[PDB]
Amino acid sequence: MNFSLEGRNIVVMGVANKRSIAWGIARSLHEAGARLIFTYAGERLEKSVHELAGTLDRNDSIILPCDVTNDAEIETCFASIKEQVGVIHGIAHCIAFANKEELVGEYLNTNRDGFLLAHNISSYSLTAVVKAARPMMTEGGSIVTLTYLGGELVMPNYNVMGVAKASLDASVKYLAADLGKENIRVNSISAGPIRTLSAKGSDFNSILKDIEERAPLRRTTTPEEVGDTAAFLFSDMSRGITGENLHVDSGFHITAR
Amino acid sequence: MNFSLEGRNIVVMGVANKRSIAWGIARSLHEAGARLIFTYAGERLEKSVHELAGTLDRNDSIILPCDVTNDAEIETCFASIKEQVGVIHGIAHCIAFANKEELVGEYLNTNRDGFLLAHNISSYSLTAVVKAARPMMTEGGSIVTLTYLGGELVMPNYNVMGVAKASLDASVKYLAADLGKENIRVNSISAGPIRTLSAKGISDFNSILKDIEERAPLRRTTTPEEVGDTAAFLFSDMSRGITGENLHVDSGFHITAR
Amino acid sequence: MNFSLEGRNIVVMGVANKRSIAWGIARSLHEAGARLIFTYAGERLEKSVHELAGTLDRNDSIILPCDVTNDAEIETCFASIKEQVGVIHGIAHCIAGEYLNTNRDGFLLAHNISSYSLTAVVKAARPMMTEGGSIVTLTYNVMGVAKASLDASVKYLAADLGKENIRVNSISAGPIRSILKDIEERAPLRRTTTPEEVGDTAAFLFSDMSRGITGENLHVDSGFHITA
Amino acid sequence: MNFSLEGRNIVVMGVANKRSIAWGIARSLHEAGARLIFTYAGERLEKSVHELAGTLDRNDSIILPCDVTNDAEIETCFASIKEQVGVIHGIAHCIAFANKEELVGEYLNTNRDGFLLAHNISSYSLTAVVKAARPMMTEGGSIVTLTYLGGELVMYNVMGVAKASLDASVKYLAADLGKENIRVNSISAGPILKDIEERAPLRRTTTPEEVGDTAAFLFSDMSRGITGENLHVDSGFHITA
């Protein structure tokens, strides 16, 4: 086996801008020679994403809208991906949401709607996407999601997000039990803190300063490092790996002390 | 210190019948000298809980309805508890639910509706009950909930229930981090399978039991008494150094599996 | 059903002084009515424990020397336990810059004293624990490696001895007394931990209240295990 | 970056025959353009390692003796690696051992010797070799060791205990060495049955190629954000009951 992804069609859901971790993954998958399929939420993000495919070397790229809440316009999105490429070999799911006033101080500032909300977007969406994409993954494939250490441990201010990530963390395991027999693998990457759109939602430079000082590899993670890990996960090089969670975070996971 | 729960009021949510784990927690806590405040899920259970509580040695037990899917009923229920006993010293969270056709076959038999229902009843309800109960919890406190190995590993057919349990597992940690400053500890018991109402709907059960009688280290299945008695510890001050923890009360099965 | 340790004989290994966690454990178990059997390593401690046994309500404690490093001595210590009481219901095992400051022999030695020793003492206690029993062990660098070895063995021990109604578990106690300050600021419960707290947890693990629990690790640390 | 191991010198230890996981691993690092330094314990393997080492093209490989007990000849070994190649970029540690009568029946079948022996060979040897290799590891690096599910909970006995020691020595080695830009990670392999084949997510068993491919990743710059990690190469067996 080798590492390349040529002839592999991968949807990368969740790019917002040049800082999106999805975007760093997009880049690494493209370098490996995959054909990317971006999906975005709304229509305000329409130009920014087209503007990013454009800047990618080869052509390839398709660009569909997909709000992950809403089964209706999820099917639309994948009926369309099938029209335009047919067999899908992979999905990078990099989509989470929480109310930002629930991510301050106490976990307890959350509430029924906010809680269900975080779980719907951050956790359920993966299952939803997988249900859609499944009929089209007929040559087997690989599914990757992004998680944070806060799913495992208590990270100041991650609060309800941490709970939903724990929910996602677990769904990864189950999805993997269901889909291994169709030779589809499901794993997560657990990225270290990196500056993104969604990253503004408390005391951030605090965390980034601590890591370079406290994490084994005295530095911060990048979207590149993550994308490179993603690239391996989407490649057959990782064919033996399913239901795993890989900390791409300078080893910060081993220091809690 | 000591084992006695004399002078403590503990709210046990989730009694349904004599087989329920909450009922095992009930006895144990009552016999350690606690005053139990029960909650049933709507009027179907009203008569059955009154009859169960009536069997206890002392006759101080309180009995209130509380349907955890609804902020208003929750505070209503808790507003009453406050009037009656003034201070609450613990909660036994024993509430779960998910759609039964979701817990057969592939995890993928779930859907947006059921997933969130399962998370709402099974995971959110804890946070819910704590928000409401927090103002009454003024002399320390112990909150205990019930999870299962399915929230750690893939268990055949546990499926979306296990994912909700994982959400629960995490909330236990975040709640504990929020509430240790007010001297309230939050923990879970991870129970081995026991035959209860809710067990039905978890298909091929006496197969799973028999397995645990052979494979389990302690070579025997769990009892609600075992669980109840670990809850007793947890509610008591003997356990005052423990919070955010998860105790497997499961005859050691968790190790023979992993 | 009861928290009492009436008529339980518990060996408590690893008492050095009034500060020992082992000692907190001793107090709490004595308090629950257990009869304590203390072991010492080297005759400097013989007097330290002998002293401490005397602070205990009842003069029912037995004092024996046991160097966990040497099998023959361990076989002797327990033969003598059996002679005096015949049967034992529990063991409390409280014996233990860069990580790269370790070396073959010190590495083995940590593992010998800190890991293997639970297995060694359990092999000896085995044929005398016929009334069922509970075994509890206490858990930085090469020590952390040895502790990890100890943790894994708890599970292997548990899986083997369950058929004999013998439970094996561990307690992880947070720092007890400068690193302290931040814990009292960063700990869920906002305080270091105490040896009473550990002890009352060991009492639970030694009684029937905990009969369904085997192969587990209990964090007595004011919640610090859940924080980053 | 790139998946190429070109111009990296990686020590591979514990090759013994064409089945050896370390061989599966040798092959994969070789394919990616690494220069392999093989080590062997005593004459039995001397032959096999040489005979096997031959198999490969681009044959720039190195062959030397190294008993992982015996601090001196570990020193002897790496002193020589230094002479012949200057700088080391990785170790593939694939050594494990415990008496077989002890990996049968109860865990309590073990004794003081087999216990310590198992820890020596299976856990300490990683520290021994990282210590001896460290000085010559002056261009960043990657250390990768071989574990299994028995260190995580019950499956295997005293070897599971040893692997737990191993697993903890990894996190520690990682924390010490990140500063010098050296990564330390473990692969936990599936069995290399009838059980795994029908109850593992990917409905199949593990191949040494799957293990080698994962290694190539961790030795390469693709995995540069990862340290103190334990990857399960096991058709998802770790997630099951």
Ligand SMILES: NC(=O)c1ccc[n+]([C@@H]2O[C@H](COP(=O)([O-])OP(=O)(O)OC[C@H]3O[C@@H](n4cnc5c(N)ncnc54)[C@H](O)[C@@H]3O)[C@@H](O)[C@H]2O)c1
């Ligand atoms: N940034 C970090 O340090 C870090 C660490 C660990 C995990 N993560 C995870 O990485 C993932 C990507 O976020 P990011 O950090 O790159 O920030 P980002 O804001 O750049 O990306 C988040 C994406 O989620 C999308 N999204 C929100 N609601 C959506 C909806 N309903 N339908 C479709 N898309 C929706 C946004 O459009 C955006 O594309 C998230 O799941 C996040 O939790 C980030």
Ligand SMILES: NC(=O)c1ccc[n+]([C@@H]2O[C@H](COP(=O)([O-])OP(=O)(O)OC[C@H]3O[C@@H](n4cnc5c(N)ncnc54)[C@H](O)[C@@H]3O)[C@@H](O)[C@H]2O)c1
């Ligand atoms: N029996 C087992 O094998 C086992 C094992 C591990 C964990 N558990 C857990 O124990 C807990 C209790 O379940 P059980 O097994 O004792 O079964 P049970 O059916 O006896 O109790 C479940 C209870 O939740 C209550 N409930 C459901 N929806 C509610 C809502 N709308 N509002 C308020 N209450 C509601 C039900 O009335 C019922 O009393 C659950 O969390 C379950 O997951 C059970």
Ligand SMILES: Oc1cc(Cl)ccc1Oc1ccc(Cl)cc1Cl
């Ligand atoms: O998961 C994350 C983890 C970190 Cl450290 C930083 C940013 C993250 O991503 C988010 C944070 C908050 C919200 Cl509301 C949405 C998203 Cl996508």
Ligand SMILES: Oc1cc(Cl)ccc1Oc1ccc(Cl)cc1Cl
């Ligand atoms: O969580 C559980 C685990 C086990 Cl082994 C047995 C029963 C359980 O409890 C439930 C199972 C299914 C549903 Cl719908 C509701 C509940 Cl309360």
